[PDB]
Assembly symmetry: C3
Homo-oligomer: 427 residues x 3
């Protein structure tokens, strides 16, 4: 371990909370499911920050409660059982909860029990917009009054912030919150801790991972070895009360210079063909790549913690489509261009790169022994702001799936060929 | 956690031993194998309460010894090797043991070693009757003269106890011990702790789990939401020296009233069609369902601890068949009725309901945080009597299969598609 | 536990370091790959003694470095990336290391970083000879000038030591170091600790394991029950400075007598049909079986530790083949004789016998509770010499594959059907 590494003792002491958040930052908004994954009267169970959550759509509205019956702890989502439009019941002994408040309103075959009405399950705020269902995953005692607006946990919006973050080389990126904004993408389980997966996206030295991607050569791009920071303010940290807490990297300005050569090895690039884009990241860990893969289109990624060693990776492309025809154009270009070359292919390289780094950090070794360099100003800056502004550190799961990693149940599922997952299997 | 729950501090303190028995209650009789699973000269390895056991039938008689060579700990049952009618040898280095006493009588290629005769492996009493081989799984130092009769660990017998447990609505249920009693059924490995699997069988509020079973609607039954206790003595606890230690639930009497409605949800049943039956459980955890699925037939269930998170679930139907004709009719009805609709179908629902609850309890959370209600007088009563009358608490396995849950051998087997099991695979 | 067992307290205290070496003996030579497994410009990752290692052949020469980028710990071997003949780069962020010294010579897209040249990854000495690539797996601080010659970690050589270890009944066994010595064989991952796999090879009481092997009855052999030591010097321990550290068993002399009968079981052999051979073992745990399976042919086995519960089992046959014709005869006899009847068949029996013993020892139980006998003078003598002459005890892996056994990555791979392994999968 060299003394020339950027993550020295003082620097590391600045992001201890981050090192302690293996299970994720709780009391934040996270994408839960795509609208198409939850139809009218459909019930679905998931897990975020170690918290089991069940969702149901009733009369067009989505509700979210803890997927844990308070009687004997089974998941309510394994066998969806709802007798009324305003409740969800446990299929085992009939404990029935109010969708709106989560209160135990009754017990199917024991309507007069003294336990009724004296307790209930945790509820989770839901915000569905333009094809996506977001859920505010919170601790049991986080007050309703303190729940912030979804926007506070989403990337910086444009043109709203075009003056704060000038972007003369490309038109404004749309937000999932914008009217007529259309979302195309997917989410799948990533194997490894969410933090390590999150840090890859805005790292300007990992470009090497994409050197051989097909889209790179199909688009005749002659990529740069990487990007180097040239000044101390190459990244802007934003932490105002009203708004997202995160950072913006001044890519395509002189604060970040592209590298073309290496005299040792003897490498040197002389074809400056490429794309104009910009990355930023905000709590709870949302990446935004402006002007990617093309103008008017933007890519967003989430690394939702499920347990301390799995996460649900989201990858979407957004574009505002005012007319029925605009939607068809975007759907078409996604289907025959974006999805096969960008989401699959370009990003697949990121997928395995993240996994390859997990072993170094899981038992704690990497958080101490990693030897960061100049380009690592990016993850380091992120860790510090995340440590300062997170709304809570999730506690390890207890008495839920994922609390114990080597149960006979898990070996059974594994024997049957099932990998660690996210969506609860039913029946 | 509501103060209105039945399992308060005082109640919980009354079943600490039960909370401590994850590996099972040792020094008890357990069904090991069906007679048809062990033919003349056949050797089979199994595991109960964490204890590896090997059985062999010689001249019609079954013997059981610890499936662990005292030399270097391999399982004797993996490659059956017996040179004489009175012994079983280890296929590795030849240590040979007397089937009757378990003494080390010799070593194939080292007949004069001084270790010979100075030690041996543990023996386990066997009791085979009407198609079933029972084994008294005991600690290494439990004395032979202290082994109790099998009947002490089997359900209450009728008509012997018909006066103690009146049953005017149905004929007496037969015992596996009765002459001409015929057994039909099966046992399979269940994933999760034995205690949680055991408590489901006699719970009168889980009826909801069967609301959709095919047999229920094929037999025009209009089930009750559940059953509620009406008096403090709705369950009779029996604990006399000579006899089984357990409890009898006074089903189909004043003490247990069927629930027909729930005003909150607006539910209400008006078709009282069903079956007459009665459940009781005795240590080590044997369920008896009288008059099920039909008169003169009785169902018995065991949840034999294998390790602390797997158990062997037994499900059998018994009926006395004095003549060859009676046996054919019972075999036929089992094959084309009981098996497909009852053992499979009705009980399969219980199988998955048990599993769904295991995660809440494995790490200990559920044993403290569960919020039991009125109908839970059943499991609570069982945990108390079990705590008071068990003949021992099995210690965790050491140096045996299951002692460690994440060995490379287990990952290899899992990769090959093999789930956690019970019967040792040979060769 | 009987007091008549050979491994009494005093004896056990003589091999504590061996009990402590679950991860293996480090600072020793080990077979890494067969020459055919690493062609010109090919890169391959492996793991020995918990240490991740990557090899590459350049201009005919093989180099080995630690398969762990010092930046953020990914394995360099997962996506082979080399820009020059004298280096190997990390495919993630471009850290580049010198093959010869392991020094960090540059960073592709950050050639001026202050970290460059101030550190590097560990290098491992390589000795390739007659088809086998050996690697000196050492601790990070083991001096280059202290690396001993490969021969010190290889079995005793003949005729060099024919006078020291007289063998009138068979011609001298060739060494992998001999000119024109040809190697044929294979290595595969073994499931369980290396020590338990290693001790089986030179045990003279496990002969029973091969009683049914096809080659035994195809060769009309009437095997002995086993062999017993007759004198205290039945094993010669060698520990001179210049040379291998190990032991030679005086098989086929009166110090080891074959057993023909067992009066207790009534067994007795009358047909002394067999083969002449002799076993010896040297650190780090290499077996040599002289005159096996035929004259002029010798079998060597390694049990290379990968982690503390997996090892790479090597099984090779060596014969000196001066002419092109001699090589074809050996290749032929291996292909249609040795491989099918000896490597597979005879040795497959040893493979499963080793596995069956692993559970007793992994949690520590067996290392204390095993009850060894007279024939165990063999493993006991080996444990003592190993404890005394090992060049170091490998420390548990940290921040590398194998450091944590139940990661979601391991469950993913297992779910996909992949067993624990050795060679790193690429892409
Ligand atoms: S576990 Fe849900 S009602 Fe009993
Ligand atoms: S392990 Fe059984 S005789 Fe050696
Ligand atoms: S992990 Fe290897 S260069 Fe970053
Ligand atoms: Fe990338
Ligand atoms: Fe049931
Ligand atoms: Fe052998």
């Amino acid at each position: 371990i060299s003394d020339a590494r950027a993550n020295n003792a003082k620097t590391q002491s600045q992001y201890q909370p981050y090192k302690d958040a293996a299970w994720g930052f709780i009391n934040h908004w996270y994408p839960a499911l795509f609208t198409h994954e939850l139809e009218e009267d459909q019930v679905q169970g998931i897990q975020i920050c170690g918290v089991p959550i069940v969702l149901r759509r009733v009369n067009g509205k989505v509700f979210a409660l803890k997927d844990q019956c308070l009687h004997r702890g089974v998941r309510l989502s394994e066998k969806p059982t709802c007798f009324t439009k305003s409740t969800i019941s446990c299929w085992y002994h009939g404990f029935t909860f109010d969708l709106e408040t989560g209160k135990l309103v009754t017990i199917v075959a024991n309507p007069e029990d003294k336990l009724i009405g004296t307790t209930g399950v945790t509820t989770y705020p839901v915000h569905e917009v333009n094809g996506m269902i977001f859920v505010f995953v919170r601790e049991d005692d986080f007050p309703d009054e303190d729940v912030p607006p979804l926007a506070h946990d989403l990337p910086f919006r444009f043109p709203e912030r075009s003056e704060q973050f000038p972007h003369p080389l490309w038109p404004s990126s749309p937000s999932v919150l914008d009217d007529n904004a259309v979302v195309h993408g997917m989410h799948r389980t990533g194997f490894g801790n969410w933090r390590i997966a999150c840090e890859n996206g805005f790292d300007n030295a990992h470009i090497l991972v994409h050197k051989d991607n097909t889209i790179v050569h199909a688009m005749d791009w002659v990529l740069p070895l990487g990007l180097l920071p040239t000044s101390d303010d190459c990244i802007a940290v934003v932490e105002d009360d009203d708004g997202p807490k995160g950072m913006m990297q001044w890519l395509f300005t002189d604060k970040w210079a592209p590298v073309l050569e290496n005299q040792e090895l003897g490498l040197k690039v002389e074809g400056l063909k490429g794309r104009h884009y910009r990355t930023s990241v905000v709590l709870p860990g949302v990446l935004m790549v402006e002007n990617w893969p093309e103008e008017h289109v933007v890519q967003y990624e989430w690394y939702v913690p499920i347990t301390d060693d799995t996460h649900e990776y989201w990858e979407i492309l957004v574009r505002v489509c005012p007319t029925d025809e605009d939607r068809k154009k975007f759907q078409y270009r996604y289907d025959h261009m974006y999805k096969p070359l960008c989401l699959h292919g370009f990003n697949d390289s990121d997928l395995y790169a993240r996994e390859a780094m997990q072993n170094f950090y899981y038992d704690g070794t990497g958080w101490d022994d990693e030897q960061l360099v100049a380009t690592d100003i990016s993850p380091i800056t992120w860790r510090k702001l995340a440590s300062r502004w997170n709304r809570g550190i999730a506690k390890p799961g207890r008495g839920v799936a994922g609390a114990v990693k080597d149960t006979s149940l898990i070996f059974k599922q594994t024997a049957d060929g099932k990998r660690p997952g996210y969506k609860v299997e039913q029946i």
